[PDB]
C-alpha cells in the first residue's frame with residue numbers, strides 16, 4: 001500500500017537491463033493510469049492507459065520536451081481491467097523501453113530521450129491502488 005501519486009527515484013537514471021516492476025489493482029470505474037519516466041521536467045516515456053477515450057480503451061505513449069507533448073504512439077491491445085490486479089514490467093533495452101503486463105509482452109517505445117542516465121524519477125499516478133514499485137538489474 002503506497003500513496004498515489006508515487007515517486008520512485010531511479011538513482012543515476014536508467015540503463016539497459018534495468019527492470020522496473022509495478023504491482024497494483026485498477027480501481028472500479030477507473031478513467032486513466034499514468035507512468036511518467038522523467039528527466040527533470042521532461043517526460044522521457046509517458047505510458048497512459050485510458051479506459052474511456054470516446055468509449056474506447058487505448059494506451060497512449062509519448063514524450064514531453066520543454067512542456068510540449070510529441071507525437072503519440074498508439075496500438076490497440078489493452079490488458080487492464082477495472083477492479084483487477086495487474087503487474088507492469090518495464091525493461092530498459094538498448095533502443096527502447098519494453099513493456100509487459102501480467103507477464104505478456106505489450107509494446108515497445110523507442111528512446112527519444114538519449115541521456116538515459118538522467119531519467120532519474122518514475123511517477124506513478126491515476127486510478128489505481130498501488131501495492132509496490134521497485135527495480136532490479138537482470
Ligand SMILES: COc1c(F)c(F)c(C(=O)N[C@H]2[C@@H](O)[C@@H](CO)O[C@@H](S[C@@H]3O[C@H](CO)[C@H](O)[C@H](NC(=O)c4c(F)c(F)c(OC)c(F)c4F)[C@H]3OS(=O)(=O)O)[C@@H]2O)c(F)c1F
Nearest residue numbers: 032033034048053054060061062069070072074125126127
Ligand atoms: C483514435 O482517437 C484519437 C483521439 F480521439 C484523439 F483525441 C487523438 C489526439 O491526438 N488526442 C490528443 C489531443 O487532443 C491533444 C491536444 O492537446 O491532447 C491529448 S490529451 C494529453 O495527451 C498527453 C499525451 O500525448 C498526455 O496523456 C496528457 N495527460 C496527462 O498529462 C495526464 C495523465 F495522463 C493522467 F493520467 C493524469 O491523471 C492520472 C493527469 F492528471 C494528466 F494530466 C493529456 O493531457 S490531458 O488529457 O489534458 O490530461 C490527446 O491525447 C488521437 F491521436 C486519436 F488517435
